[PDB]
Amino acid sequence: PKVIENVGCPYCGCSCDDVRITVSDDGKDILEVENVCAIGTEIFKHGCSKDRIRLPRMRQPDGSMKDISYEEAIDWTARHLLKAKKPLMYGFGSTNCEGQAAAARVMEIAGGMLDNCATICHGPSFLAIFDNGYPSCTLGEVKNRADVIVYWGSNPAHAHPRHMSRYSIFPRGFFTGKGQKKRTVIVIDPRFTDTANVADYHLQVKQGHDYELFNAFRMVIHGHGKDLPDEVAGIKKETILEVAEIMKNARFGTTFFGMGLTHTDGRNHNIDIAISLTRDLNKISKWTIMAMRGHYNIAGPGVVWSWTFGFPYCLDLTKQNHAHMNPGETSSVDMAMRDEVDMFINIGTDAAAHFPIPAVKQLKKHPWVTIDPSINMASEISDLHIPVCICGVDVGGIVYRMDNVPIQFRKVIEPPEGVMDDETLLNKIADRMEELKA
Amino acid sequence: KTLNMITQRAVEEGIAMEIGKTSRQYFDACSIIEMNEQDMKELGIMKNTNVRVKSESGEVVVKAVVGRQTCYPGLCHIRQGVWANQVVPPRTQSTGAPQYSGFPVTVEPVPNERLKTALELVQGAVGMWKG
Amino acid sequence: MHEYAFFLGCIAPNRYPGCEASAIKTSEKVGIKLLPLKGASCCPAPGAFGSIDLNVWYAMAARNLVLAEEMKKDIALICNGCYKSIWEVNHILKHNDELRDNVNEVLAEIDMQFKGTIDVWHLAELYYDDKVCGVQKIKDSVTTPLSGAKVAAHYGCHLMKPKKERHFGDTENPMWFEELIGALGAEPIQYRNKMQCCGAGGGVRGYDIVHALDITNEKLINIQEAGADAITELCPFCQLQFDRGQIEIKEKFGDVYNIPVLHYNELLGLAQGMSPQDLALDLHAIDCTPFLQKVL
Amino acid sequence: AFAVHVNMERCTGCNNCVVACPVNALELNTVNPSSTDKIYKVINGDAVILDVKHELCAGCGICVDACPYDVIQLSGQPP
Amino acid sequence: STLFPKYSKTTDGSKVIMEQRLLQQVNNLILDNDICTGCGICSEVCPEEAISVGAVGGVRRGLVDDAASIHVDETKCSYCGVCVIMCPFSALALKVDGEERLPILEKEGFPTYDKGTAIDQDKCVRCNICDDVCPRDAIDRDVPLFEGEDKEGLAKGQAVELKIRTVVGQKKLGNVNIIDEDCCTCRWCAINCPTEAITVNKIFEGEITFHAEKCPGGCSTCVDVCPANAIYLPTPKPAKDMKGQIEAKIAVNKDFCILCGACVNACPGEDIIYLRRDSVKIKGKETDLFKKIKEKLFTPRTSKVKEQPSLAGSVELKAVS
Ligand SMILES: Nc1nc2c(c(=O)[nH]1)N[C@H]1C(S)=C(S)[C@@H](COP(=O)(O)OP(=O)(O)OC[C@H]3O[C@@H](n4cnc5c(=O)[nH]c(N)nc54)[C@H](O)[C@@H]3O)O[C@H]1N2
Ligand SMILES: Nc1nc2c(c(=O)[nH]1)N[C@H]1C(S)=C(S)[C@@H](COP(=O)(O)OP(=O)(O)OC[C@H]3O[C@@H](n4cnc5c(=O)[nH]c(N)nc54)[C@H](O)[C@@H]3O)O[C@H]1N2
Ligand code: SF4
Ligand code: SF4
Ligand code: SF4
Ligand code: SF4
Ligand code: SF4
Ligand code: SF4
Ligand code: SF4
Ligand code: SF4
Ligand code: SF4
Ligand SMILES: [Mo]
16 A cells, blocks of 8 residues: 555556555555556566566476576676687566676676667668668657658558557647647558557558558659659559648648558658658658657667777677677567577567577577566576566666657565566676686 | 468566566467457468467468458468467568568368467477477 | 366366356456366256256255365356256255165265255356455456447347346346346347247257257347347356257258357457457357457 | 446557546646546557546547447446 | 236337237327437426436437336336427337327317428529538438439439529529428527528527636547537647647537537536526417426436436436525
């Protein structure tokens, strides 16, 4: 019955911080959680569990898995990181920004490849940002000004549940006092998703033809739109002209995109034609692209490694004094394919589940270490499983929202007696490696 | 028959993973095909029956249902997870983003065959399936 | 999540296991938790065993009741005959003192006493009650519409009759079970003499199979005339009669109906998305495939 | 004064029924707020209707039209 | 008991049919739910207090299925037909045996509304504006359809009486009228007619006021349910034109408001809307019943939040002093 305000929900890009927890009398049981979506409710319900991992656990010859002390696990990982020739550390989607700084230091000492879930998720988007730029905005800007909203290839209803009710559509802002009723929502994707149910338009496009769709829109905008064919990408020219007229007349627009663009043919060229469209619309209106980042602090590795090495993802830290970045050559999946690794470290992700199974097969040839709070597929095919605190429930810190706005997450439960957090763990690994004098 | 395919999200799927990747909720949420009613009739797939989704980079036995989110004739959909990534092709096009949406696949109605659990799928792909 | 001991008599586990499997799954999907009963047996089947000896009927039903009494839980049932045995012996021994005494000194030979502390419910009764899962909750849980199917309900006799001994209301033309089928999306149809016995009760199924089959055939004729595509039922006796007896009617007489017979729990599973293989519809004598083509 | 029913089984906690209700929007979005009572609040991930005695709803349909995966049934007949 | 006063209430498609059986005599109060507009001028007028008003916004938007705009207690209704005479948009009909039959008018016991419609065919020019602006489908224009949108009614060149040169005077091909039982006296067609050839007079007179500062924004239920589309959401100004005045949230056009009351019945706010009618315009003399009905219609009203629970399932407004 000790109600705690302003907590952070640590799952989706929304980084919602309007969460209220009613912690038990002893400060270690969560009773009721208000204002959060279900996916979040379950995160907190799992964090407040009574039967949770407390010590590392090693793979014995028999194939079972027995516990070891933290110092022994740190010794194991340090010795292996030094003995290896090009270790790969992957993850960082779900960690505080101190967890993504400590890891950068550890792999600076080691000399391996450091990488995050950007490669497999919105890294194709960054590659377009490198090409064309990122005309964007914070989310309060679309809350307080947006007149048109476009969800191109995204599905907020199931990806980011309270995105619509917090930032985009339903809130009544300052210059949008009328709320939804003066917002025009356009949703583009081949399915008739729940976002399309809520929407007012829908451009059911053939899966994979978004490049042709964007080119049609941009010819319309550039002015001689009469040269369009009868239909484009399955969309009909009159509907194209309708949506384009709405976009032109928008007082302040905003485009959101997701897997519909970053996981189909022409991974980054879809995103950069979208960005070109936004830059073209800002000739006569105000339009701001914006990427639907997935995990809470998945924009955290981007900024932290931007300030540390200058490169958001796919870091080639093997020269030990100059880093390199080329996603086609230094990314986790391509290196796993070309068996270019020597050790895989699972930190803040589920590589076993969410990688292609050929890549997982290629990777498991080498040692495999997992730093997770709870059991998952990586912790089931790893060699040792080091527990760690959960961001936002057992430990606080900074996280980075969809739009690179830092939210400060709070602590609601003390972690089980013995369990440390990743910044302490990565720092101890780095200290032990320097002790081993490499 | 060529039957283009995508792999995407669902709230029940997110809920399931945060219950736990090894839970009955996760099994129920992810082992799912959400295809079109016209395609189900034309192929010969009984609603709520196992089916063999076999692409060039694998194979998986997955329950076949119909989804509210109306897939147009010629589209498939698995909620992302163990089962979908058993069949996702690894081609990246030198970008690091595998072909997670938009790969061809053939669908074969194969009832009377069980579904493979998440642990069984992954630990057997690696060669660790003790149980 | 309400919790009930799941009695699970003889025919559902040993002839139609899909009925019990769907019972557990669908009850869990709605807010009900069905717990196994530890060492329960045949509820002394009211016809074939009550006709022989009422005292041993009382003793065995009381033993089944005191198992769940020790479990400290309320019985949940899926059979009208099991409901008769369990619920009615519970009700009789909650009020008749000399019968309590007699049953107790019979049960004292196995270190076991009846005190009358629990209640007995039919699963469909729970699905209909508003405190427990209601019709609206069933509609919410339904995910496959099952639309465009004509479905005939068979209430049975031991759930609702005699109305001076039960609490379900009118026995002449009840509509409550028709509301549960309408919740699933299937339209329930009305047929002549819908409240007729199926003919399997009282041991007639065994004593005079031709007599029992004639009683069943009267129903099957009325149902076909109405135009049903399946027959829902709340009793494994009645399901066995309507299922086997169609085959025995096809052989002893020359009548062909091919009307699938499904328990309401099996239809609820189909509505909630369970697979036909997971429901074991291959264990029925009468093929359900036309009905599956219609509703799928 | 109508009655709204929320299917808890498919409610995702999206909170677009709370934000869009025009009786909820009375407190913070009106000059000199008249009534500060609220129909819905998302407690434990599902929308709970605090309007137990059916006194504040006006059958507007803004909340039924708002929920992305239809889950709110509006009853226009006396409860 | 006794059975033959069989009271039934069936929803046959889109018509809610309320019936009273006898052996040979029936009584059918039939409400056409596609034309009802959610005003309460049928509940205020009911002599026997049977008609109540339901989920106006939801039903008028299509989000409600198990109800109509209005609920009539057919056990209390007396089948007088006062509701049918006093409904501005005829969405209620009385059928005694099988025919639309109003005994109270047959005996002249009740006045009727003087919508007073007319279109001087010596001034109308077959324009298309009056059919286009009509909020309800009440302009029956009977004109041959020329090459515009169809094959020629006569010919493009015979749309003008030409001697083949000069036009001979005037053309006026066809005939245009106003279905007098459907017009609601909004006056969109009179105010916008090019040749001032339409004569309609509003049935009600009074004033309606909108306190824009009390609308909670995204609630365009009033806009959605207004029959005469008098209400609008005032368009937000562009930048470099706002001039420090932000915007209004809602407003009305008193030229087109017909003082119906659907806006008041639909608004979920507290007192955004103030409705007061001052004079109904009738033909037919009068009655003590009609004076009572005038007194009932002419009481000022406004919205209300948190009405009483005992009447849950209907609407209750605020009595303004
Ligand atoms: N078929 C298909 N597969 C896909 C995709 C697709 O589109 N289709 N998309 C791919 C993409 S977009 C990515 S993001 C992946 C996403 O997939 P992942 O990035 O793997 O996301 P999760 O599986 O939820 O990882 C959560 C794990 O991190 C743990 N954790 C939580 N907090 C912390 C912390 O603070 N510190 C540490 N050390 N651990 C913590 C959690 O307990 C959990 O074990 O899916 C990918 N796989
Ligand atoms: N419950 C739950 N929530 C999540 C996640 C989860 O796994 N479970 N993952 C989180 C993370 S890691 C991610 S990155 C985010 C991302 O989630 P989102 O970026 O919002 O994308 P998706 O949810 O996968 O749905 C993408 C939509 O694009 C459609 N689409 C597919 N192909 C095409 C195409 O070719 N063209 C167009 N125009 N559309 C196409 C798809 O049908 C789908 O409707 O969600 C996060 N939220
Ligand atoms: S939208 Fe995402 S961050 Fe917000 S409450 Fe839901 S899961 Fe948490
Ligand atoms: S119908 Fe309108 S007033 Fe009633 S709960 Fe829904 S949004 Fe609120
Ligand atoms: S809008 Fe729908 S899904 Fe979202 S909280 Fe309300 S009822 Fe639940
Ligand atoms: S008076 Fe109004 S509410 Fe009553 S029937 Fe006529 S249009 Fe409908
Ligand atoms: S016919 Fe008369 S009594 Fe009946 S509802 Fe209409 S006005 Fe009221
Ligand atoms: S608006 Fe006037 S001139 Fe035009 S068609 Fe109508 S009545 Fe005739
Ligand atoms: S007054 Fe209004 S409703 Fe009547 S004919 Fe003119 S435009 Fe139509
Ligand atoms: S503006 Fe006039 S016509 Fe429109 S709803 Fe209000 S009172 Fe009725
Ligand atoms: S006047 Fe009523 S219907 Fe119109 S915006 Fe205000 S509350 Fe909503
Ligand atoms: Mo992601």
